[PDB]
Design a protein around this ligand. Structure first.
Ligand SMILES: [Zn+2]
Length: 202
């Protein structure tokens, strides 16, 4: 769980979202056990992005091989309870656009956010991954957490799925290109991860 000071820091951070602007949301991992969560407002450029340690390591390993390619050891330092804290702090009656709403539905509903409405924009495999190369080429420095080799079931190597890149590239398909806004993280780096570097005299 988050400290009281962090919860107040989160609330002030969540204020940067426009409750009536177009907001994308995508997750990696199943809604009952998500490991990467991203929200994206292309108008203001704000984006929410954080990670979570998985509960089902067996399901995580299969999800890593065929989807996100995340090393589980990179998730040991994630802030616990951050998923519930961020979902609790989302603006009320917000409308969220997503590709595949039924799992975004399960996640938000498990946290009691029935006020949030979902727009299930569905796209082809061609349209959803249309700007995949352009988005990764432009924003690869926003997520270095996809270190494993991902294959698609014969098996051949594909580009790993990132919840943040998915939001950007799905919006790129609908809007027909990359948005000109400069992307800015809403969540502080020290709220997403807990520092593993001990204070040492040198
Ligand atoms: Zn990612």
């Amino acid at each position: 769980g988050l400290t009281y000071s962090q919860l107040m820091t989160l609330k002030d951070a969540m204020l940067q979202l426009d409750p009536n602007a177009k907001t994308w949301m995508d997750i990696e991992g199943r809604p009952e056990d998500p490991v990467e969560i991203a929200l994206y407002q292309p108008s203001s450029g704000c984006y929410i992005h954080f990670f979570r340690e998985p509960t089902d390591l067996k399901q995580f390993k299969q999800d890593a091989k065929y989807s996100h390619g995340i090393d589980v050891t990179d998730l040991f330092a994630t802030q616990p309870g951050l998923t519930s804290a961020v979902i609790d702090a989302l603006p009320r009656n917000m409308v969220i656009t997503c590709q595949g709403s039924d799992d975004i539905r399960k996640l938000l509903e498990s946290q009691g956010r029935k006020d949030i409405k979902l727009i299930d924009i569905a796209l082809s495999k061609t349209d959803s991954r249309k700007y995949e190369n352009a988005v990764w080429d432009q924003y690869k420095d926003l997520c270095h957490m996809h270190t494993g080799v991902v294959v698609e079931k014969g098996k051949e190597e594909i580009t790993p799925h990132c919840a943040l890149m998915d939001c950007i590239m799905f919006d790129a398909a609908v809007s027909g290109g990359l948005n000109t806004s400069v992307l800015r993280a809403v969540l502080p780096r020290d709220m997403v991860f807990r520092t593993s570097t001990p204070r040492v005299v040198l």
